[PDB]
Design a binder for this molecule. Structure first.
Ligand SMILES: CCCCCCCCCCCCO[C@@H]1O[C@H](CO)[C@@H](O[C@H]2O[C@H](CO)[C@@H](O)[C@H](O)[C@H]2O)[C@H](O)[C@H]1O
Ligand SMILES: CCCCCCCCCCCCO[C@@H]1O[C@H](CO)[C@@H](O[C@H]2O[C@H](CO)[C@@H](O)[C@H](O)[C@H]2O)[C@H](O)[C@H]1O
Ligand SMILES: CCCCCCCCCCCCO[C@@H]1O[C@H](CO)[C@@H](O[C@H]2O[C@H](CO)[C@@H](O)[C@H](O)[C@H]2O)[C@H](O)[C@H]1O
Ligand SMILES: CCCCCCCCCCCCO[C@@H]1O[C@H](CO)[C@@H](O[C@H]2O[C@H](CO)[C@@H](O)[C@H](O)[C@H]2O)[C@H](O)[C@H]1O
Ligand SMILES: CCCCCCCCCCCCO[C@@H]1O[C@H](CO)[C@@H](O[C@H]2O[C@H](CO)[C@@H](O)[C@H](O)[C@H]2O)[C@H](O)[C@H]1O
Lengths: 310, 310, 310, 310, 310
């Protein structure tokens, strides 16, 4: 009969969420309870009823007794797992308690930035049993798994935390146990309001206000400058994401700013040649519509982006 | 009866304080005195009264004698702890002296940047007993714990250092000991006066002085440039912080600069159209108030920020 | 007779493709099946028919029995291979199953950026037998090798995956086995359309539209600014590549932008001196051709680049 | 009687001096000669008169014989010491020769940037005896300690190298030996002349030359631009230092550039309003003093900075 | 009699050349053949004629037999050497074959940037015998040492590869063997033509062409902008080098650009005041020489730089 391996994973810190590399790093602890009756002992007269081991001594003991351990792997770990404690407690009836405290980075392949920065992302850690389920069957350790009270993450807010058990077939024909700890996180938007939204809005609006001069050349100069600045914003914002194969909401907004600025310049050149070839009064009359249409474009385009993505 | 484990933590260096990642790194040393009578020995004729061990040999000896060690964990450590010395001295009556010298990064989850750069932050290191308090009870080693004389930190100044003992329930139903070494630090403000405050003040004041030209178009051009520069300052300053979900005092000051610059531009456009449609004398009379109100806004807004945050 | 070593390499993650350093990093797993009859055992009465080892214990056992293992090396690995599991399963007839799970960076010396960003690159991992082929002959493990379902790579798309066996002579006069896992990848072009192509097109076209002012000095000013911006784009784009000894398609396009902008400026200076020394009407007539030739240059040059590289 | 431990530290490379983190990294080698008569042996017939050990085997031998080793610590090491060789040679009379070759970073808490870039800094490595001086007394190994011939450091020049012995009380009530290797270094100034001094001088002087136009508005525009550029220089230069709590000479020079530029702008606005309200001839007469006082300010301020700091 | 240690070093990859840190990183392999007759064995009946060891087991065997190994050190290694394989093959007559495959960074203290980017640099790896030459004498392993076919380096081209044997006295009074593998490399210049040379040439020439306007103020404005851009190029280019104590050819060229631009501005101010105080015709006549002398300065200065450095 397969042996039961109870698994608990506890995330104590989120040291970082790297959206460009699409990974996240955590400090967490793994707890395993596994009753192996072959490990049963009897303490000596007035002798310890629980035996404490390093991971190394325990594995050497298991090899000497020819006992297979429930070997596992963090399936989506990437890089070096920095271990703090790898401790074993062995009770008299053969129950092995294992504590593994670590820091490690994990892949986040469910990142979808289409709604960025209004996106809710899925983060998980997979713990895979290497041996098949007719040898070991992972269970859920009760009252341990989850997320901690001081995760130390400022941009992200955890919205849902979940655990469950599934299967994998990485190395065996038969099914092998997989423990999953997953959580969902959304962003705090204050950073994007302050550093991205409000600057762009101020530039656009300050341009509109300066449009009341009635000097078409000034409009063209200012609009060219605004386009340059918007392209600087494009490069800055794109730096923080991966080189995605699809368009983000932020990309749509920035392309809108590019296009609206260019159309502003074009309309101003038409007005300036209208005033150049004698049509100054027609130029001013149409300047009325230029003013009364600069912000209609931005409102309408914002509604269009909302309709598309949401 | 529970065994007493005396704990001392000494911080010798602050190698860095990373406010963006909200962590800090230290070079420090841990001292543990723990009397285990089972470890008592007798030296041979004219033989050493104290035995020196590596951590590895000592733990193998403890496992061979089936003695549980007071296993501990740096609860808020993140990443790899680089150990320098892990030494053991065992006296004849069984007193274990342990020296652990290390470099490690630690989480700083109490960072609150609301008053930045006038903030005083709390930094701590937690040392957790893995086993419950009916087995081991942490005490305070006397005359060892604290902070050193050459911390090597230039921006921060330590204001208070403290130690105490509390409990945790990370891995056991029963309470387990927790040793805390905490200190409070504030910033030196010279960097912010020289690189942030004085440049912004110079830009604002040089703009005001140039406002005495009486050429409204020059005001608009200069103000647009000033707004661009202030947004560059926004991006630079925000780069050094995390993507906070709340507004910092620095954010409030930068938003004030944005808004005041935009209002300057708007007032200048109104003046320029007043001079455009025949009201040159009214334009100049109101230019008087424009000048006499440019700095009132900045003083009043600075007082408003002080009132809000302090 | 040489011993057969069956090899399987599975790539589970592409943690990154570094085109500047010309390397790529993966999380993957290596599987080796190797029948060594000298390792045959018999389980005790009702005793395990498969023995589980750490890599270290197994190698010590092999050394004690004076059995040569099929030593191998990742020929194009660079840096530190971070191992997760190094596990051994030994069956009763002497079949060794080895599992090696790792993270490592690998050289990508086949990077050819001539068509960048329309390039398809070759990535491979070489696994080399250190000992010659009269001792060990690598075979292909069936149903294991390849690439996974969640590679986590956003810019690149895998187009072909392949495995095969070849030889090398790194350390022996005789041939030694080499296992190769290779795959081809191309880029998603969305990043380059949004962040590179469309901004450059907008700048060029907005310049052309502003050319309808009929103010030659404005043309010269705007063109100088455009040249400056294009050189900023040159530096940015080149930052992401290595310091290649040959010209990339992107380099050709940027040099074209430089030259076309300079020719624009030159033509405008000629027009401005034509209008300066009395030939205003001739200046305007030729301005017709200036306008009707600004975009012909860009279309013709784009066709020329396509002809050259493709 | 305390045992003599002769110490030699040799610095072979300076891999880097990090003035922002206030540390420096070296490749060096440590030599220890320590006569322990308990380690005396006799070679077998025609057998080696010197025994070669790894550090690990030697420490296991010492533990088996219950011999305390002279445990030491690099007191100002920070981070991971990457060891190359840790070798032991044991002669027949019990003299242990130890070779430790390493790479490591070390704290530089004596950095004082007040005169930067004309500063001479103190760099040291402390080697601390953990055990008190009634057990071990550090001596100086003769003809080994110092700095090498190829340090590989380009910006810094070593001016003085010194060794000596002192005491510490880190872990014991009694005094413990401390070996110090210190050296003083100054900078090559060519980098600062070429990249900092000459650009600033060129900007200032080119501004002065352009002041001979007699167009006050051009002066104001150019001066505003110069102030912006000087603030860019401020941010760049400050990036390379820590966030110091005191003013550097470079900070004083940059603040001088800010202030002189602002005063230039102010004087030009006064001249422009003098010419505006009818006083063109008075404006020109005072423009004479404006010109004849622009460089007096810079010379006088440079002398003032020299007087203050030197 | 001293024992012969045959040495072969093979460089398979150049993972990077870091000219700012003046180091280079390689993936390479070390081969050592060393006949120690004390290691001679006899295989059992039908038993392996060659014994395979890990480095650790072999060193423990050597210590047990009290055999001194030829201990060596990579003299100019800096940082951590990441080992891939450390394998031993021991033949029946006692010949030890050692394979060491590694990744490591090495100091490049022969970097001389005076002719940069037309410089040919010397790169070497030193392998030092720790023990003196009356114990071990390094020889050259034949047919192994050198550089590989896929070095993976794009900017540099290897021009000469060499090996030889010399001596050192690092740790012993007597001479100890030193094996040297050195190679010379030069740069591909395409990067510097495309990203540095051609942009600067375009800026200079586009300025000259715009000089045919005959509007001195435009010349001054454009020249000031060009000086600013050249100083940006100075900072960018200097970022990639160390903070050298001497002047590079690139530094000379950039200082030339600064000075020529400033002289352009000065001449234009003189022309503008000549036209201001009534001498418009003299101003134009001398403008002829201004034009006919702008490029003479650049050609003459380029010849001067060539004469100085070459
Ligand atoms: C006065 C009381 C004294 C009694 C004993 C005190 C505490 C006992 C010490 C237990 C620590 C185990 O000792 C050592 O710890 C570190 C991390 O902590 C482990 O970790 C080390 O190797 C593992 C290998 O994966 C790495 O993850 C890790 O980066 C590295 O530092 C070591 O492999 C272990 O050998
Ligand atoms: C002439 C006198 C000679 C007498 C002996 C001299 C000194 C004795 C040497 C004691 C050092 C112990 O030897 C070695 O030291 C380093 C750090 O120092 C330890 O540290 C190493 O493993 C631990 C694992 O967590 C890591 O933290 C560390 O990054 C790594 O370098 C080694 O695990 C230890 O095996
Ligand atoms: C309740 C059940 C408990 C039963 C036992 C549970 C699991 C058994 C633990 C097996 C892990 C092996 O133990 C340890 O693991 C880490 C990685 O995982 C290895 O890895 C360590 O050394 C290798 C050396 O190349 C490095 O690649 C790696 O960076 C480092 O962390 C250690 O060398 C190994 O000693
Ligand atoms: C044909 C002749 C062959 C004869 C033998 C040849 C040479 C003998 C090899 C001696 C090297 C010792 O073997 C190994 O070396 C590396 C560095 O070199 C050491 O270093 C390793 O652990 C220490 C721990 O602090 C770290 O500093 C280091 O980053 C890590 O790589 C290993 O701990 C040691 O086990
Ligand atoms: C089915 C066949 C199975 C038969 C056996 C298969 C192969 C045998 C495995 C040999 C590898 C040796 O095992 C392990 O490898 C890694 C690198 O590879 C070594 O390297 C490790 O320690 C050294 C110390 O300097 C470091 O350089 C290195 O960064 C670290 O990963 C380990 O010290 C060694 O213990």
């Amino acid at each position: 009969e397969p042996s039961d391996v109870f698994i608990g994973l506890k995330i104590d810190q989120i040291t970082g969420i790297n959206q460009k590399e699409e990974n996240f790093s955590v400090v967490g602890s793994l707890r395993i309870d596994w009753r192996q009756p072959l490990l049963a002992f009897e303490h000596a007269p007035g002798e310890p009823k629980h035996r404490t081991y390093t991971l190394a001594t325990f594995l050497k003991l298991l090899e000497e007794k020819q006992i297979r351990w429930p070997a596992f792997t963090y399936h989506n770990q990437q890089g070096r797992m920095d271990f703090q404690n790898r401790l074993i407690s062995l009770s008299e009836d053969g129950t092995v308690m294992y504590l593994e405290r670590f820091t490690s980075t994990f892949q986040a392949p469910a990142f979808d930035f289409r709604l960025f920065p209004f996106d809710n992302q899925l983060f998980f850690i997979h713990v895979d049993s290497i041996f098949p389920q007719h040898l070991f069957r992972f269970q859920e350790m009760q009252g341990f798994s989850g997320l901690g009270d001081q995760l130390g993450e400022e941009e992200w807010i955890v919205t849902e935390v979940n655990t469950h058990l599934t299967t994998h077939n990485e190395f065996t024909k038969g099914d092998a146990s997989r423990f999953v700890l997953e959580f969902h996180a959304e962003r705090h938007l204050n950073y994007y309001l302050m550093r991205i939204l409000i600057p762009v809005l101020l530039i656009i609006t300050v341009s509109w206000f300066t449009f009341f001069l009635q000097d078409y050349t000034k409009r063209i100069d200012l609009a060219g400058g605004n386009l340059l600045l918007f392209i600087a914003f494009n490069f800055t914002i794109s730096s923080d994401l991966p080189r995605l194969g699809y368009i983000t909401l932020m990309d749509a907004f920035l392309v809108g700013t590019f296009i609206i600025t260019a159309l502003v310049v074009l309309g101003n050149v038409w007005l300036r040649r209208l005033e150049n070839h004698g049509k100054q009064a027609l130029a001013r009359k149409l300047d009325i519509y230029a003013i009364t249409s600069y912000p209609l474009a931005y409102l309408l385009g914002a509604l269009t982006l909302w309709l598309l993505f949401f």
